[PDB]
Amino acid sequence: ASGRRAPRTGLLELRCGAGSGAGGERWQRVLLSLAEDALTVSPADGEPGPEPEPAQLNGAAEPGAAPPQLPEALLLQREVSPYFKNSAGGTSVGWDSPPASPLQRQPSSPGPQPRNLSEAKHVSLKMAYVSRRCTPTDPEPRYLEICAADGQDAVFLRAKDEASARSWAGAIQAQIGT
C-alpha cells in the first residue's frame, strides 16, 4: 500500500547517437512515466524495493536475431572471442574479421546489472513543452520531442505506434498546456 493515483506510462524508445551526423544511432527501449504534473523516464524497467521478484523462465531460444540489434557486449568482448595471446601479429593469418557473430544465450533469467540510465529522468510539467516531430523517412511512428525549462532539456523518443506517439505527444501537451 503506497499511493493509488498512478501516473500514465508509455513504452517508448530513446536515441543515443548524439555526435554530428546520423549514421551511428544507438537508440534503446525506455519507459515514459508520464504524470499529471511530472514526466519521468525509465529504462523500460521498475525500481527495486522491499518487494523482491523471482527470475524469469524462457524455455528454448537459439541465436538468430538479425532485425534486433543491442550493443554493449560485443564492443567490450572484442579481443576475447577470437582467442588471445597468440592472436597478435600483423604478418600472416590476419583473419580477425568475423563475418558473423552467433553468440547469444540466456535472454532472461539471472539478475545482471543493467547499466545505462541508472537514474530516471524526472521533468516538471510547469514550463516544459512537447512536440511531435517527423523523420525524413517516416516509417510509421511519428517523432516525439519534449523540451524542459530545467536546464534546457530535450528528450527525443520514437514510439512504435502512429496513433500512440501522436496521442502521447498531444497529451504531454495537454498537461504541459497549463
Side-chain angles (χ1 to χ4, degrees):
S2 315
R4 225 67 202 281
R5 215 76 76 79
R8 190 172 262 281
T9 73
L11 264 181
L12 258 100
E13 217 96 53
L14 177 77
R15 198 162 162 196
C16 194
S20 166
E25 300 134 327
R26 221 109 72 79
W27 276 82
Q28 181 202 295
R29 195 137 75 171
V30 301
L31 241 197
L32 270 61
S33 326
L34 184 102
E36 307 254 80
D37 59 83
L39 192 288
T40 298
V41 192
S42 230
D45 215 48
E47 308 273 45
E51 246 178 86
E53 51 142 36
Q56 303 222 105
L57 312 149
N58 206 334
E62 307 286 302
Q69 301 277 117
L70 296 176
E72 244 182 73
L74 319 93
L75 292 96
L76 248 93
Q77 277 258 302
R78 234 196 78 197
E79 47 144 301
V80 188
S81 263
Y83 238 49
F84 194 74
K85 238 220 177 148
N86 216 243
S87 318
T91 179
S92 179
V93 64
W95 295 327
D96 268 50
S97 55
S101 192
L103 269 294
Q104 190 223 41
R105 244 220 246 78
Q106 214 147 255
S108 264
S109 249
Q113 314 294 16
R115 239 263 216 162
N116 233 299
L117 235 147
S118 170
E119 262 95 270
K121 230 201 262 292
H122 305 242
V123 188
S124 280
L125 295 185
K126 272 108 140 198
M127 50 197 169
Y129 7 58
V130 47
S131 77
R132 201 207 318 96
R133 274 100 156 79
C134 218
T135 33
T137 36
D138 213 23
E140 249 218 300
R142 288 242 157 190
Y143 213 44
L144 265 126
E145 202 298 320
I146 311 167
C147 276
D150 200 67
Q152 264 308 272
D153 307 68
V155 287
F156 287 82
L157 307 130
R158 206 266 308 284
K160 55 267 141 102
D161 218 64
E162 208 282 82
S164 306
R166 181 238 215 200
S167 279
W168 255 111
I172 301 150
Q173 186 137 339
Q175 310 294 354
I176 298 168
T178 171

